[PDB]
Design a protein around this ligand. Structure first.
Ligand code: NAG
Lengths: 251, 253
């Protein structure tokens, strides 16, 4: 029912197995399959596979933050049909495959920040497309985000793409995102941007902005100074984006 | 001389140029060369080169924490002779070269944690052979032991949260002042008893006769776990009785 290092709190017909900061080397196999909240954060589990979370139908909240997971097997979360939140932050993941995130069909929160993700498959989020309300891919090495998947989530209200290496933002990626309230693009490799609407919150500070005529539409907006800086042309290098007059954006 | 976004505090002939959280894309070139404390943390500077810190003789404290440094040029800190502390944590450094950490001759503290360091040159630290060396939270499989073993003043070595699988027999031999050694969350399966505070939790310990010496020590339970043999897998290292650490001769040359 409860693994030796773990503590189980039985709420009104609801199981919560807490194994946080207990020095685990791998997910314990003696966890009850009736558990709803599985907390495995601050451990040292390096590998996830199919038998770790097999037959767990009613698992709602699974947190695996600040671990040492370098590899996630094909269909590790395959039986997690009720999974509404999945935390995989502060890990060593480099590539996310199509089979890795298969399973949580009603997933609403996906935290994948603080890893070393360089490539994510285009069909990785295909099983949790409609449901996904929050997508966090902060602090990774991402050059290209899977825009086809991220653009097919009608319920997404938060997308954290900050602290990555994204050099291009296409024009069809912002289309069809009605509930999008937050889009963080801080600390990336973006030099140019294309006129995008729905300006209610977009952050783009710490980007190598090319302050010329192509970036004059953005300079005309009523937005706060988030300390955005010009990296090129050399005359504008070092100067704040919101402090340089509109007449100095020449070609 | 003070750069437009930076604030300079002159406290009794002590220049403190603070540029933290200013959204800088690169180290400003209008910084006074007489500065002693240069704070450039929480900035978005991605590249360091030799003209960024040239002619700064009296620079003692240089902090570049939580930035986006992916590359450090050859002899970037070349003229920082007085540099006693260098913070380069929370960055994107993957490989440290021999010429990269050249310059600070009297360096006493070196923080290189939170990066993605996979390889470090053997002669990178050859200029300051240091009191504190931090290489935590990186992807290090092998650290420069020949360099780390040639620092007679080293009192702290943080190797935790890396991928170190082996610890050589004669490295800490020349380390007399070593008081702290963090080895938490690594790939270490076996340890050798070579003394003269050590943490080793979160390692894939092979709990047999080879680690029985460690089990006999009067140490607190830092939640160390056995990964092998299969009978001891999952159980705590400090909870398994000493009689259960059995083995067969290793038969090696
Ligand atoms: C200001 O700093 C300079 C050295 O850069 C020093 O000569 C001067 O005395 C300092 N001013 C005060 C009031 O301490």
């Amino acid at each position: 029912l409860c693994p030796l290092p773990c503590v189980c709190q039985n709420l009104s017909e609801s199981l919560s197995t807490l194994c946080a900061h207990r020095g685990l080397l791998f997910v314990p196999p003696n966890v009850d399959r009736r558990t709803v909240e599985l907390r495995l954060a601050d451990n040292f589990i390096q590998a996830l596979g199919p038998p770790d979370f097999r037959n767990m139908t009613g698992l709602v909240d699974l947190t695996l933050s600040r671990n040492a997971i370098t590899r996630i097997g094909a269909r590790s979360f395959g039986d997690l049909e009720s999974l509404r939140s999945l935390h995989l932050d502060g890990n060593r993941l480099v590539e996310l495959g199509s089979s890795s995130l298969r399973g949580p069909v009603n997933l609403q929160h996906l935290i994948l920040s603080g890893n070393q993700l360089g490539r994510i498959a285009p069909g990785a989020f295909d099983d949790f497309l409609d449901s996904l309300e929050d997508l966090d891919v902060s602090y990774n090495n991402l050059r290209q985000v899977p825009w086809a998947g991220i653009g097919s989530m009608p319920a997404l209200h938060t997308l954290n793409l900050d602290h990555n290496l994204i050099d291009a933002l296409p024009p069809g990626v912002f289309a069809q995102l009605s509930q999008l309230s937050r889009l963080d693009l801080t600390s990336n490799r973006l030099a140019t941007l294309a006129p995008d609407p729905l300006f209610s919150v977009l952050s783009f500070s710490g980007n190598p902005l090319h302050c010329n005529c192509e970036l004059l539409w953005l300079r005309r907006l009523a937005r706060p100074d988030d300390l955005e800086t010009c990296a090129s042309p050399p005359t504008l290098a070092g100067r704040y984006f919101w402090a340089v007059p509109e007449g100095e954006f020449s070609c």
